[PDB]
Amino acid sequence: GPVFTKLKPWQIPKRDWFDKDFLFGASTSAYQIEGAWNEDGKGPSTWDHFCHTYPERISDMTNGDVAANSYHLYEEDVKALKDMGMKVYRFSISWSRILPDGTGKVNQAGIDYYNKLINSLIDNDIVPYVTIWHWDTPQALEDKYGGFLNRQIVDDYKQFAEVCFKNFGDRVKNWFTFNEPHTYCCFSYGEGIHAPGRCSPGMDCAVPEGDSLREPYTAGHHILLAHAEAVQLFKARYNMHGDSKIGMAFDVMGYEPYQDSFLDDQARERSIDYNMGWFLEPVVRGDYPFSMRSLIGDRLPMFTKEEQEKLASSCDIMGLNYYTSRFSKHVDMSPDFTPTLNTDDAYASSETTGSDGNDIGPITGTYWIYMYPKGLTDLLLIMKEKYGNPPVFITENGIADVEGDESMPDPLDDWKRLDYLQRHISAVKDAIDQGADVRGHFTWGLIDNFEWSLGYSSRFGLVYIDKNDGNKRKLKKSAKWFSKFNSVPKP
Amino acid sequence: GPVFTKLKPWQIPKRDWFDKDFLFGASTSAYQIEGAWNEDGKGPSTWDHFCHTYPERISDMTNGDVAANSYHLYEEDVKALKDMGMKVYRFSISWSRILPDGTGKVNQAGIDYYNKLINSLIDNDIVPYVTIWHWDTPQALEDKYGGFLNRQIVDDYKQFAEVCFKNFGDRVKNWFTFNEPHTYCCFSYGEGIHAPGRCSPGMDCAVPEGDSLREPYTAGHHILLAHAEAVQLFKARYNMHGDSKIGMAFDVMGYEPYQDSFLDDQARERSIDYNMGWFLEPVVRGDYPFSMRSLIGDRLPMFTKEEQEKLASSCDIMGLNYYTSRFSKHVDMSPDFTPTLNTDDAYASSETTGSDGNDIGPITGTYWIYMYPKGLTDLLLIMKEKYGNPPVFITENGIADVEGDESMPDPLDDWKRLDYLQRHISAVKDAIDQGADVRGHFTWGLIDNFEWSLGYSSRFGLVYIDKNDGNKRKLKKSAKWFSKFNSVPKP
Amino acid sequence: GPVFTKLKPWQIPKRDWFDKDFLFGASTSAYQIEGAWNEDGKGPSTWDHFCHTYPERISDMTNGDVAANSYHLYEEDVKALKDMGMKVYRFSISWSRILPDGTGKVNQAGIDYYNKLINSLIDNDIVPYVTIWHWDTPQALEDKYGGFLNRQIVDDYKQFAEVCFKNFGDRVKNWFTFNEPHTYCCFSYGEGIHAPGRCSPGMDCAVPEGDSLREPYTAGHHILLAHAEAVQLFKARYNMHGDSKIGMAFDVMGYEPYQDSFLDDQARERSIDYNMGWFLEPVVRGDYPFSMRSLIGDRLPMFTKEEQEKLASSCDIMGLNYYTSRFSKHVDMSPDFTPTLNTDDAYASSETTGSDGNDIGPITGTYWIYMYPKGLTDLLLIMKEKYGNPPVFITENGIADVEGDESMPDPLDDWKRLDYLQRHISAVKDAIDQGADVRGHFTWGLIDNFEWSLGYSSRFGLVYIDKNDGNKRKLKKSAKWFSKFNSVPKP
Amino acid sequence: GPVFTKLKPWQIPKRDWFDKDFLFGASTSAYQIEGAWNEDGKGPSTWDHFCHTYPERISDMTNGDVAANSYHLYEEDVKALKDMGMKVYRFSISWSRILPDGTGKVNQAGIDYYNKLINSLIDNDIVPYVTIWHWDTPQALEDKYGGFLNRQIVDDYKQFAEVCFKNFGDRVKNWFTFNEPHTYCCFSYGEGIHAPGRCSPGMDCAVPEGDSLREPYTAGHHILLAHAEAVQLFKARYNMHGDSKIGMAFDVMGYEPYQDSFLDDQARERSIDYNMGWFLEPVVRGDYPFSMRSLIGDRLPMFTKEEQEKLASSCDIMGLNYYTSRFSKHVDMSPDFTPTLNTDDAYASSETTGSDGNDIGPITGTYWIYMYPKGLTDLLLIMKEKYGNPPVFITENGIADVEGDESMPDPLDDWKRLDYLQRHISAVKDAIDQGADVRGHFTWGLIDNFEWSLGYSSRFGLVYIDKNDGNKRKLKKSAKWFSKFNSVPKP
Ligand SMILES: COc1ccc2c(c1)O[C@@H](O)C(=O)N2O
Ligand SMILES: COc1ccc2c(c1)O[C@@H](O)C(=O)N2O
C-alpha cells in the first residue's frame, strides 16, 4: 500500500553482468549540493535570484544557499563514492562561481575549488565526468540581456566552456555541455516553475511576462548553438591527445501508446521527438525533428547551413537521464484545440494511466516517478536502431523518498530505491544484450540534495544528508548494496 | 470512471473475419430462464429446493420460480435469436421437468415442451446445441442418496441422458453432457454458495455439514463417470448416422503469472490444471492432472483401468465458458499453510491485481468480471498445442450490467457489453489465425436471467427482459449490433 | 562397432572461440588420487572404512589405499597440468587428513601437504579451485553419530571449512563446499552402492539397515544446512578483500521427453527438479523444488525461516558436473506404483532409449555414459533463463575407457575421449553464444583414478597412470591435444 | 521388441483436421491384384513373363496369375472402399489386357472390365484416379524391340494412353501417366530384381546382359518422352471441358544428412535430386537435375529443345509415393570409387543408420520401411518452396506386415499400420499448416496384394485378403478406424 513487489533474489544484477569497461557511478549538480552561494567572490546565478526573489515558488520555502554544503564538505562526497566503490562521479561546474559576472575576470577561488575536487577524485581512483552547465546561468547575464533568450549567450557560454577546458582539461576527459535542455526549456520558459520562472501572461508563474509558445524554443535554439560552438572549439584546441570526449545529457521519458491503434503509435513518435528528439536530433543530423518543424513552424528557429553542419555529429557520448515513462495519447488538429503551452505542440498528451485504466507502473514516492524499466530499454534500442548506436551513458536514474510518506519512516531503509535501481540496471543489461552501446550507469543522487521547486522535501540520494546533524553523510541501504556489488574491501 | 476505452471502429470484427462454417449464437440454461418450476408435473430441482429453503442465500431474495418465463414465452426467445441472426441456440434440458422423480416415469408434458422449442428453432433455421445438465439435479435424488455425492447418480444420469437422446436425438445433433463442473463443485460443495449449499462445519453456507476438501472431488468424480457412461451409450446407440457430436462445457479463467519468476510460472500451470484440467484432462487422457493427484492425493478418487479408457477421448467438441482472467501467485508448501477449501489445493492464489499493483483489466460491472481478452486467446492456444487442438466452441462469453451501477442507467444502452464482446470475438479470430480449431462463439445471455446467488441483480443478456412489463423481450444495443453483423434483412 | 563418428576437422574448438578470461582446467578428488590413507596421522574416512570392511562392493576388489599416490607424487600432477597448458586445477581437501577425528586437533602434516600443492600450482601459474568435501567424511564422525544423518555434522563441517579458509584462504580464492550432493545421497543412502553403503532392509547393499525413502533426504538436508553455515561464515570473515568466491558443484544429467507429449514434458521437468533442483533451488531461493515437496512431503525436511534466508543466494559460482543425458518417461500416480527408492519420488523414469527405440546417444565406454552434448547446452540455458544466469563452471566433464573394451586396446590412444571433449567444449560455446554465463570447463580426470564402486576398471584421465610402472604419468592423445589447443610452447 | 510406441489418443488425426475438399483414398495396381492374367484375350505382360520364366526371382515362388482375383471380385474392392468411407480409389489399367499385342486390336473384354469398375465406383460415390502404366509393359513389345529401352515405346505408349482417354475419359478426370519411374528404372534395369530383370554382366539378376550404368537412364528417358507425348495429346484433345487433370506418381524417400557437415548437406541434395528430381525436375522445367547431368554425362540422354518445352509444366498434379527415409552420406570423387550401379551416380550412399549410430526410425515390418514421418513433411515443403507448390497427392503411403513376424500373429490386428498411417496423416496436416498444397492421402494397400519380388509374403492392405478362404476381403483394425474417421453410417 502502495503494493511494491521486489525482484526475486536471483534476478538482482551482479557487477559481472557487465564487462570490465562498464562504468558505475553517481551524479549531482552544483546548485543542488554546493551551498556557499556567495562565498569567495561567487556571483549569483539565476537560481540564487529566483529563490531569493520568489521564495514561495519552492514547495518547502528552501533554497540552495547551503544545500549539502559540498563547497566545504566535498571530501565527504568523495568518501561516499569510494565507500560504494563507484568508478565515476558526474558533477557540474558552477558558471557563476567561475565567472561571477558571467564574462570577464575568472574567480581563482572557484578554479581552486574544482581542482581540489578533481584531484581528490583522481587520488581516489574515481573518474570525473563534468557537466559544464546545469541550469546554472549567472544572473549577471540574465539581467544584462535575458540570458538564454539572447544570442549573446552563445559566445559567453563558449568562453565559459573554454575556461573549463583550459583549467581542467588536463585531467577531465569526459564532458557534457548541457543538462536536460528539454526539461529546462519546458519548466523555465513554458510552465515557468523553474528559474528564471517565465510563462505567458495570465499563467501562474513568478514572471508571467514571457511567451510559453516561443521562449522555450528560443532558449533551446541558443543552447544548441552554444553547444555547437563549444564542441567545435573543444575538438579544435582541447583534444590534441585524442582521448577526450564531449557530449550532452538529455532528459528522457519512455512512451507507450495510450491505446493500441495506429493513431497513438503516431502520437508516441511525436512524444519521443518532442521529449528526446528536440535536442538529440540536432546534435545528430543538424536539425530538429521534422514533426516539430511541421507543428511549430515559425516559432521554432531555423538553422543556417553552417550551423547545421557544426551541430551534426557534435556528440561523442550521449547522456540519458531516465526516471519514468508515460502513455502517449493522440490529439487531433482541429479548431477545438489551440496550443498555449509549448508541450501542446506535440499533439500527444502524456498520460500516467493507460487505455485499460491501469497506471503505467507503481508510484515510487514523488508524484511523477512511476516505475517502468521497460521504457528505458526501449529508448536505448531506439538510440541503437535509429540514431546510429552512439556511446550512451545513463547519466541519471533513481527515485525520490518524499517527506510525509508514511511508508518510508526510516530515511536509510531505502529498499524501494534499491529495488528500482536494480531493476533499471537489469534493464540496461537487457539493452546491452540486444546490441545497444551502453557504457555506464550513474545513479542520480550521490547524496540527497535540493530538488528545485520541491526543495529538500524530495530525497534522491544513495547517501543520506543529515540536515539536523551537520549535513553528515550516512550510507543508505542502497549505498551499502553498491559496496557489496562493487566488491569494496571491508574494514 | 471506471475508465472504459472502446475499440477503434476499424478494429470491430466483421462476420467475414470468420469462414462460412463458423457459428455465432447465444446461450441460456433451464433454471435460469424457464420458470414454471412446478407446472405440468415438473418435480423440484436442487435449485428450487435451495432457494425455497434458504431464500436469504440469494442476494436480492429472488428465485427461478418464474425467471423469464421461457416455459411459456420460448417463441419470443426464438424470435430474439432470429432478429439477431444467430445460427445457434445453446440451451439446457431440465432433468426435473423430464423425470420429476429423478428416475422412473417420464413427464410427457416436459418432452412436449422441448420438442416445441426444438422444432421452432429448426423452423427458424437455428441449430440447437443442448446441455443435458446445468446444475439442475432433481431434489428427489438429492433426498434419496445425496445426489452427486453418491455413485447411484451415475446410472440415473445415464438413463436421463438416454431419454434425451431417444426423444430429441433425431433433430438435436450436438450435445454437452455437463456445464461447468469446476464451478459447480467449487461453489456447491466447497464454498457452498450454490445448491445444495454445502461446506465444512464452521464455514458460512446454508448447510455446513459437508467437507470442502472432499465433497467437491467426490461430486466431480461422479460427474466424470456419469459423462463417460452417457457418451459410451451415445456413440454405441445414438450416432448411427455418424453426424452427431457430444462433449462437455468447461468454465475457464485465463491466468498470468503474478510476478515474472519461474515460481509463478509454475503456479500459473497449477491454476490452469485446477480450473480447466480438473475435468478436461480426464476426458482427454482418462485421468486428472498430475499436479492435482500429487497435491490432493487420497481426497481425489482413483479411476479404474476401464474407467480411464472410457473417459479418454470421450469428447467430440469442447465448450469453453470464458469471462475473465486472474494472476496466479505461488503459495509454498509449509506448516504455515493448511488447505481448508478445495481451491487451496492448487497452491496458487488467484489475484485480480498483479505484482506491479495494476488490476488485470477494467471491471465490466459485476465484481468478478475483469476484461482481459488476451486470456482467452492464450487458453485457446493451450487447447491447440497441448490437448490436440480438438473442436472448440466458446459456449459462454459476456458481461453483466449490475443493479445500482450509476454508469449504466439505461439497461438497453449496453455499449460496454458490446465492446467487450467485440474484443473477445476479435480474440477468437486471433486464435484461429494462429491455428486454433475454434468453431463458434455463443454469447452468454441470450436474455437477462437468474444469475444464481446474485438473483436478477446481474443482467447478462443481449436481450433485455422487462420484468415490470410482462417479461417483454427488448433488444439491447449489443443485440442490434449482431443484427447488423449477421446481415439480417431489415423490415 | 559401436559406430563412433568423429567431428569434422573444421568443427573442432579452438582456444580463441572463448575469451581471454575463460578458464580451461582438469579435476580430481582426494580419495580418488591421494593414497597415503593412513599416513602422517591421517584418520580413516567413510570410504577407507567402506572399502576395508566391504571390499567385495568394489567391482575389481580395489580401494584408495594408494590410488595414484598423489600424496607423494603431486608434483607430477602439477607437471601434467602445466604440460597441457591448463589454467585451473580443481581438487579436493581430505577432511580426515586435516582432522583425523573429524573434530579437534588439526593434523599439521595434512595442512603442510595442501600448502605444498597450492604453492606449486601458483608457482606454475595454475589457479586452484578447491572442493572442501568430496564424499570424504571422517569415519570418526560416522561412528560417533552417523555422519551426515545427524545434525551435528552441520557444525563439525563448519569448523572443518573454517580450518580450510584460515590456512588456505590467503591463496585459494575459489571454493566449492560440496561435490554432487544428489549423486551422494542417491548412491550412499538410496541404492547404498557408495559409502557408508546404506539402503532399506531387503535391498542389496552392504548395510541394509537404513531407509532408501528417508535417509537420502535427511543427509541432503544436513548438507544444505552445512553449506549455508559455511558460506555465512566465509562471507562474514574470509572475504575481507572481496575477491573470493564460494559455491557448490552439482551432478547433472540432461533430460529429453521420452515421447512427444505434454505428460513427458512434465516428467522431464520433474527429472530436472530431482536431479538438479534438489540442491540448486535451495541455494538459489532457499527451498526445495515445489515438485519434490508435493511428492515427498513429510520425508523431505522443512527449512525454518532463517535457514531459508541463509540458503537463498548462498552461491557465488555454480559448478556443473555433466557427463550424459536421459529420456524422462512419465509415471502415473496410482495404487499400482509405490516408491521404494528415493529416485522413485520423481515419478519420471530415466531411460537410455527413447520412444522411437533409439539410444539417446553413442555409448562411450562405461555403461552409463551415452554421448549427448545437446543436453549440456540445454541445462546451461535453463541456468540462464530460469535461475538468474549465475556464473557457471563445467566442473566435471569426460568419459571413461573401460577395462576389457576391445575397441580401446591402447590406453593412450583416447581419440574417443578427445572427440567427446571437443564436442562438449563446442556445446559450451553454443551456450555462451546464446547468452549463458559459462566461465570455464574442467575435464574430469586430470589423471586416471579410483572410480568408486568400479575401482580402477574405469579410466577417466586425460593423463594415464601406469599402475605397473610406478604410477608414472603419461599424456594420452587427448592431453596432447590440449597442449596444442592451449599453445603450450614446445621443447 | 522392436519397441513400438503409439501416438497418444489426442494426437490422432480427425477428418475435420482437413478441409471438405481434401481426399482420402486407397491404392492398388493391376498386376498386383487383378489375376486373370490370360483371361478373355489378355496378352502377357513383362511381369507375367518374368515370373513364369524366372519364378525363383520371387521370394516365395509366387506370381500374379490370380493375386486377389480383382478381375472377378472387383465389386468386393468397391465394397471395402465404401465400408471405409474412402472418397477416392487409385488403380491402374493393364496395358496387356487392353492391347494384348502392345499395339493394334483393342481387347473389348478389357475395356468392358474397367468400365464396370469405373461405373461401380461412381455408383458408390467414389472418384477414380487412374494410373495408366504401373510397370505393366506388354511382353509383345519387350520381345519386339526391348520395350522401354527402345524409342518405339514412346508412340506405342501414346496410342495406349489414347485408348484409355477415349474409352474412360468421359468419367475418369484424374490421371497418372507412370508410376514410380525411379523405382522401376533402378530395380528393373539397375539391380534387375524387377521385370524384365536386367543388369550388368557379372551381376546377380535373371538376365545379366544389360548395363546397370546405362539401361536405367535409357528407360527413364523414354518414359519421360512417352509422358510428354501423352500429356500433349491429352491437353489438346481430351480436356475440352477443362476439368481433367493428368500427372505422374513419383516414389520418394526423405533424406537427412548422415552427419552434421556441409558435405552431407550437399550429399542430401544429390540424393533428393536422384530419387525425386530425376523425373520430377524434367516435368517441371524440362530437363534433368544439374547434379545428375554433371555426374552421369553421356550416359544420361539429352533432350532436344522441343522435347524440353513439351516436358516443362507437363503435370497438373504430382503424386508422391512415400514410405520411408534415409540418411545421405557423402562419397568423394576419387580413383578409389568407380560407379557400377546407377545409384552410385549420386555419390551419396543411403544409410538406415545415422552418424550417432541410431536407426533413422523404428522398423515397421518389412526390412526397408523405417518409420520417419518427418521425412514426408520435409519433402512436401520442398515441393512448395522449390518446385512452385503444385497440387500434390500422397498417392501411396503405408507399411507391410510380413510373414514370419512373431510380433504380428493376427493379420487383422494391424495396430502398427494404423499408428504409422495416423502419424503420416498428421505429417501431411503439418505440411498443409505450413502452406504446402497437399490435396489428398491414398493409403497404399486397399487390399493385400502381390508385393513384386517378395510375393505375398508382404501384406500392405488396409483390407485383408484371406487367400485360404476364397480371397475373401476382411477389414483389418486400420480399415475399421477409417470407417470411424470418415463417419461411415453404421448398420
Ligand atoms: C515532472 O517534474 C520533473 C520531471 C523531470 C525532472 C524534474 C522534475 O526535476 C529533476 O528531478 C530532473 O532531473 N528531471 O529531469
Ligand atoms: C466468481 O463467481 C462466479 C464465477 C464463474 C461463474 C459464476 C460466478 O456464475 C455464472 O456467471 C457462471 O457461469 N460462471 O462460470
Ligand SMILES: COc1ccc2c(c1)O[C@@H](O)C(=O)N2O
Ligand atoms: C550412474 O553411475 C554414476 C553416475 C554419476 C556419477 C558416478 C556414477 O560416479 C562418478 O563418475 C561421478 O562423478 N558421477 O556424477
Ligand SMILES: COc1ccc2c(c1)O[C@@H](O)C(=O)N2O
Ligand atoms: C527397397 O525396396 C523397395 C523400395 C520401394 C518400393 C518397393 C520396394 O516396392 C513397392 O513397395 C513400392 O511401391 N516401392 O516404391
